[PDB]
Scaffold this active site. Structure first.
Site, PDB file in Angstrom:
ATOM      1  N   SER B  33       0.700  -1.311  -0.012  1.00 36.33           N
ATOM      2  CA  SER B  33      -0.001   0.027   0.107  1.00 36.33           C
ATOM      3  C   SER B  33       0.933   1.436  -0.249  1.00 36.33           C
ATOM      4  O   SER B  33       1.927   1.474  -0.580  1.00 36.33           O
ATOM      5  CB  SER B  33      -0.955  -0.012   1.203  1.00 36.33           C
ATOM      6  OG  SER B  33      -0.150  -0.337   2.645  1.00 36.33           O
ATOM      7  N   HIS B  64       6.956   1.502  -6.283  1.00 33.63           N
ATOM      8  CA  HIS B  64       8.174   1.348  -5.270  1.00 33.63           C
ATOM      9  C   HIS B  64       9.040   0.211  -5.625  1.00 33.63           C
ATOM     10  O   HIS B  64       8.779  -1.013  -5.969  1.00 33.63           O
ATOM     11  CB  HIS B  64       7.553   1.110  -3.935  1.00 33.63           C
ATOM     12  CG  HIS B  64       6.473   0.159  -3.964  1.00 33.63           C
ATOM     13  ND1 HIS B  64       6.334  -1.072  -4.726  1.00 33.63           N
ATOM     14  CD2 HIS B  64       5.043   0.249  -3.304  1.00 33.63           C
ATOM     15  CE1 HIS B  64       5.129  -1.688  -4.436  1.00 33.63           C
ATOM     16  NE2 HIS B  64       4.350  -0.991  -3.527  1.00 33.63           N
ATOM     17  N   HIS B  86       5.024 -11.356  -6.347  1.00 32.06           N
ATOM     18  CA  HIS B  86       3.754 -11.923  -6.609  1.00 32.06           C
ATOM     19  C   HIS B  86       3.753 -13.223  -7.259  1.00 32.06           C
ATOM     20  O   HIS B  86       4.522 -13.104  -8.237  1.00 32.06           O
ATOM     21  CB  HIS B  86       2.608 -11.137  -6.903  1.00 32.06           C
ATOM     22  CG  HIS B  86       2.521  -9.529  -6.100  1.00 32.06           C
ATOM     23  ND1 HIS B  86       3.366  -8.440  -6.044  1.00 32.06           N
ATOM     24  CD2 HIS B  86       1.852  -9.211  -5.300  1.00 32.06           C
ATOM     25  CE1 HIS B  86       3.271  -7.491  -5.363  1.00 32.06           C
ATOM     26  NE2 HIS B  86       2.148  -8.080  -4.481  1.00 32.06           N
ATOM     27  N   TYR B  88       1.420 -13.815  -9.565  1.00 33.10           N
ATOM     28  CA  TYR B  88       0.873 -13.511 -10.980  1.00 33.10           C
ATOM     29  C   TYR B  88       2.037 -12.901 -11.571  1.00 33.10           C
ATOM     30  O   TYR B  88       1.802 -12.715 -12.840  1.00 33.10           O
ATOM     31  CB  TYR B  88      -0.282 -12.449 -10.717  1.00 33.10           C
ATOM     32  CG  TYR B  88       0.123 -11.062 -10.093  1.00 33.10           C
ATOM     33  CD1 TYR B  88       1.146 -10.226 -10.798  1.00 33.10           C
ATOM     34  CD2 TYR B  88      -0.219 -10.737  -8.697  1.00 33.10           C
ATOM     35  CE1 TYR B  88       1.387  -8.894 -10.011  1.00 33.10           C
ATOM     36  CE2 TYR B  88       0.002  -9.654  -8.150  1.00 33.10           C
ATOM     37  CZ  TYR B  88       0.739  -8.533  -8.732  1.00 33.10           C
ATOM     38  OH  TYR B  88       0.972  -7.207  -8.417  1.00 33.10           O
ATOM     39  N   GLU B  89       3.214 -12.598 -11.292  1.00 33.97           N
ATOM     40  CA  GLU B  89       4.489 -12.215 -11.989  1.00 33.97           C
ATOM     41  C   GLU B  89       5.085 -13.250 -12.537  1.00 33.97           C
ATOM     42  O   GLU B  89       6.021 -13.409 -13.422  1.00 33.97           O
ATOM     43  CB  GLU B  89       5.384 -11.294 -11.329  1.00 33.97           C
ATOM     44  CG  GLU B  89       4.646 -10.020 -10.760  1.00 33.97           C
ATOM     45  CD  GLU B  89       5.624  -9.360  -9.501  1.00 33.97           C
ATOM     46  OE1 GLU B  89       6.325 -10.133  -8.568  1.00 33.97           O
ATOM     47  OE2 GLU B  89       5.692  -8.036  -9.656  1.00 33.97           O
ATOM     48  N   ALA B 116      -2.597  -3.966   0.240  1.00 35.84           N
ATOM     49  CA  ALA B 116      -3.845  -3.269  -0.366  1.00 35.84           C
ATOM     50  C   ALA B 116      -4.528  -4.397  -0.441  1.00 35.84           C
ATOM     51  O   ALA B 116      -4.463  -5.439  -0.651  1.00 35.84           O
ATOM     52  CB  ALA B 116      -3.383  -2.569  -1.461  1.00 35.84           C
ATOM     53  N   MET B 219      -3.912 -10.231  -3.501  1.00 34.45           N
ATOM     54  CA  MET B 219      -3.194 -11.169  -4.145  1.00 34.45           C
ATOM     55  C   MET B 219      -1.722 -11.384  -3.550  1.00 34.45           C
ATOM     56  O   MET B 219      -0.899 -11.743  -4.418  1.00 34.45           O
ATOM     57  CB  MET B 219      -2.895 -10.656  -5.926  1.00 34.45           C
ATOM     58  CG  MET B 219      -4.187 -10.477  -6.334  1.00 34.45           C
ATOM     59  SD  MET B 219      -4.248  -9.476  -8.001  1.00 34.45           S
ATOM     60  CE  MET B 219      -5.846  -9.119  -8.387  1.00 34.45           C
ATOM     61  N   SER B 220      -1.672 -11.446  -2.289  1.00 33.80           N
ATOM     62  CA  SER B 220      -0.549 -11.686  -1.726  1.00 33.80           C
ATOM     63  C   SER B 220      -0.577 -11.829  -0.122  1.00 33.80           C
ATOM     64  O   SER B 220      -1.568 -12.175   0.437  1.00 33.80           O
ATOM     65  CB  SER B 220       0.635 -10.276  -1.849  1.00 33.80           C
ATOM     66  OG  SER B 220      -0.008  -9.288  -1.175  1.00 33.80           O
ATOM     67  N   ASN B 243     -10.251   0.032  -1.980  1.00 35.06           N
ATOM     68  CA  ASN B 243     -11.582   0.024  -2.903  1.00 35.06           C
ATOM     69  C   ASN B 243     -12.507  -0.847  -2.264  1.00 35.06           C
ATOM     70  O   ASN B 243     -12.342  -1.778  -1.547  1.00 35.06           O
ATOM     71  CB  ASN B 243     -11.487  -0.164  -4.327  1.00 35.06           C
ATOM     72  CG  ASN B 243     -10.876  -1.596  -4.434  1.00 35.06           C
ATOM     73  OD1 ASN B 243      -9.686  -1.789  -4.209  1.00 35.06           O
ATOM     74  ND2 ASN B 243     -11.304  -2.430  -5.156  1.00 35.06           N
ATOM     75  N   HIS B 257      -6.592  -0.138 -11.268  1.00 32.68           N
ATOM     76  CA  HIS B 257      -5.406  -0.102 -10.686  1.00 32.68           C
ATOM     77  C   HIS B 257      -5.062   1.350 -10.373  1.00 32.68           C
ATOM     78  O   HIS B 257      -4.252   1.672  -9.058  1.00 32.68           O
ATOM     79  CB  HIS B 257      -4.079  -0.352 -11.416  1.00 32.68           C
ATOM     80  CG  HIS B 257      -2.989  -0.655 -10.707  1.00 32.68           C
ATOM     81  ND1 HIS B 257      -3.012  -1.329  -9.532  1.00 32.68           N
ATOM     82  CD2 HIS B 257      -1.657  -0.139 -10.977  1.00 32.68           C
ATOM     83  CE1 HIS B 257      -1.534  -1.077  -9.139  1.00 32.68           C
ATOM     84  NE2 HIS B 257      -0.912  -0.775 -10.071  1.00 32.68           N
TER      85      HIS B 257
HETATM   86  O1  HPA Z   1     -10.538  -5.650  -5.479  1.00 36.63           O
HETATM   87  C1  HPA Z   1      -9.491  -6.020  -5.261  1.00 36.63           C
HETATM   88  N1  HPA Z   1      -9.123  -7.472  -5.833  1.00 36.63           N
HETATM   89  C2  HPA Z   1      -8.163  -8.361  -5.746  1.00 36.63           C
HETATM   90  N2  HPA Z   1      -6.675  -7.680  -5.081  1.00 36.63           N
HETATM   91  C3  HPA Z   1      -7.090  -6.421  -4.668  1.00 36.63           C
HETATM   92  N3  HPA Z   1      -6.062  -5.605  -4.304  1.00 36.63           N
HETATM   93  C4  HPA Z   1      -6.747  -4.503  -4.127  1.00 36.63           C
HETATM   94  N4  HPA Z   1      -7.804  -4.195  -4.319  1.00 36.63           N
HETATM   95  C5  HPA Z   1      -8.250  -5.511  -4.802  1.00 36.63           C
END
Ligand code: HPA
Ligand code: HPA
Ligand code: HPA
Lengths: 282, 282, 282
Positions: B33, B64, B86, B88-89, B116, B219-220, B243, B257
């Site tokens: 974050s 960052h 992550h 996903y990378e 986040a 995702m982490s 969000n 994003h």
């Molecule tokens: O809405 C989201 N979904 C998945 N990962 C996230 N990381 C921040 N916001 C989200």
């Protein structure tokens, strides 16, 4: 992903076994829990260390050493796996399930699977035996499946059904036998759910597992049942409820491996006579 | 799958760090974050680019840059990860979690994880900070686990429990500190659920995630918590609710994003003073 | 995991197709179910066997042979995939979705996906057509995703949203067209859930799938929709309900492949005229 074993690999291993023993089993048992001692009740037993059998996946069994034992149990000829393989050790599902296909090629028609499991169903007590009526395959949802890759028609079809995986007549016999044993606790029956491991579940994970309808949780058995059903093996199995899962943040403690080992030890005698009696009804 | 790092690999990396800095951290912080700015408040800071540290996974951090920073934060010596890895990378979980084991070998005893997250709980508002009380590991259900493969006894046991992963006393301290900050919004607390990514969820997926009991999605973090707990690290963490997830087909819009980046920016100052104050109570 | 195809690979395949046909499609259709016969209604059709197109994944399609057909359908120029790839055959998601990116580079703007599916929703009858309104990606939860690995900016963004994956206007048009066909059965609409396969679900798995909110279950389509949306393709799709899933232990029988093939055969004519009419409204 694709299975690394060709049909000939399985056949070679099967041929090697037949030329090294005169035993010809009809039933194959994959021992879990305190059933590891079941080898002590075989007649005319002959042991094979997994490492001396060609193509057999390397051993990595805790407590009970990886041996394949042939013998007569309560008048029936069978072969037993003392120690199995788990995905959490690093094995792909096609290595884990390798023995099941070899069993088929030896002439085996029935497979009995046993395991230790955590109790999700609030009515289960430590020591309980739960017949496996159905299963939930989490790894399967993501594609982690022992059948992934090209289908070997000599073993079975491309899209095998699993709604009838656990033999109905077998579970009926199991209930009668349990009654005949004069047990005070009733024989449980339910849905087993498999996940990868090796870590134990968190409270949040246990609550969703239960909400999804699972009665017991474990880290094995399902891939073996899938491959067995694929090649036409009649399957029967049960879980030894070795502990009740922590489902509240005021954790009285936490699931530990010594706890499960103790349970397997304390119920050993009961599981052994049960499986022995079942042989007479297969 | 099996971890590609031998115990000696971790040790070599740890030894290299010790010979290049006089700092000896007790706390390790993995910044997510708007906490990326936390490096600006360190005293006697010394930076190491991930690419110059042997065995460290290649950097791929957005915004960052991948730096490992040592320094004193509010009187406590710590080391921080500016940017993490992550799945996903393309990284396997054993590369993602490599830093956690190195931290252990440096003498670190406490790990603070931040991230986040999307809000699933209807009571969360953008800007909210949610202490992580528990987690749901979806990748773990299928076998995707940083501990998969042979267990390294020098780090921990084969079957570690996770029901007590998030330190209780830490979360108590966090609540007191928040009160002392005179914040109008209350400090949230809940279950974080991790999934692979990199795409954002659909309405149907968000509804099931919420029904499964999750409060926030990301995702982490989970693989890092698992490895940390495995080797004995006291873990504390929190998510910045960047969000609120779209949960109705009359989508007012869709998660993007830029939205999450803005949130991380707007709450930066609040997260920094919070983590700084917490140092005094570890 | 990382996609093994470089952007240039896709481009080369696209360039090869353009130099071998004068057709320039705007719509791409991936045929499933009894829609395989749709190739019989193309005008000026030109066929390409998957094996003769560079970089195209090897064929492994059952029944309908792997051919890529260009042609005019009801006045619109399109290209169709007769047979697709599935994870259960051993293909990684980046091989499965290879065609979708090639379609984009040919100038295609709209993608229509069709499949066969098992009915979870109690109101569906065999023969029903269900517009796909949303999806649940189980393999995605564990990280199995066609976008895993470094992002190719020339195709799309790192974190694409999926809450708006199924075009709204397309589904509106679909409802009007169905009305104009004077069908007695109503056009269904719902959530499709994908799992790996190739085995069929157990009763316990079907009950949780339904509880999670899914209406239909299948072993494809989702990875293609994800990649399509990533590169900006307008997506529309539907499932042919080929069978109703067994959800009670008093199994009247069990899902079988011949059953699904028969359904695809019996509804072929209805699906073909439907897709043909839709071309006029894209
Ligand atoms: O809405 C989201 N979904 C998945 N990962 C996230 N990381 C921040 N916001 C989200
Ligand atoms: O609680 C448990 N969880 C997972 N596997 C298990 N195997 C025995 N007990 C357990
Ligand atoms: O019942 C089913 N299950 C999974 N996939 C399917 N595809 C058609 N029918 C089915």
């Amino acid at each position: 992903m694709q299975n690394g074993y060709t049909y000939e690999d399985y056949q070679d291993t099967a041929k090697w076994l037949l030329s090294h023993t005169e035993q010809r089993p009809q039933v194959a048992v994959i021992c879990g829990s305190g059933l590891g001692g079941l080898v002590n009740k075989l007649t005319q037993a002959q042991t094979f260390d997994y490492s001396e059998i060609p193509n057999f996946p390397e051993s990595t069994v805790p407590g009970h050493a990886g041996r394949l034992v042939f013998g007569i149990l309560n008048g029936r000829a069978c072969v037993m796996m003392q120690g199995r393989f788990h995905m959490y050790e690093g094995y792909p599902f096609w290595k884990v399930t390798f023995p099941v296909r070899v069993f088929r090629l030896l002439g085996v028609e029935t497979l009995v699977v046993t395991n230790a499991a955590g109790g999700l169903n609030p009515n289960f007590e430590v020591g309980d035996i739960m017949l496996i009526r159905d299963h939930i395959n989490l790894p399967g949802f993501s594609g982690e499946n022992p059948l992934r890759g090209p289908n070997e028609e000599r073993f079975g079809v491309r899209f095998p059904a699993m709604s009838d995986a656990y033999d109905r007549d077998m579970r009926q016999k199991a209930h009668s036998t349990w009654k005949q044993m004069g047990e005070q606790r009733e024989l449980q029956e339910g849905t087993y759910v498999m996940l990868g491991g090796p870590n134990f579940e968190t409270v949040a994970e246990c609550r969703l597992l239960r909400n999804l309808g699972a009665d017991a949780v474990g880290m094995s058995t399902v891939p073996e049942v899938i491959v067995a059903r694929h090649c036409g093996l009649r399957v029967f199995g049960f879980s030894l409820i070795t502990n009740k899962v922590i489902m509240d943040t005021e954790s009285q403690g936490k699931a530990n491996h010594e706890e499960v080992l103790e349970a397997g030890k304390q119920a050993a005698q009961k599981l052994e006579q049960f499986v022995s009696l079942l042989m007479a009804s297969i």
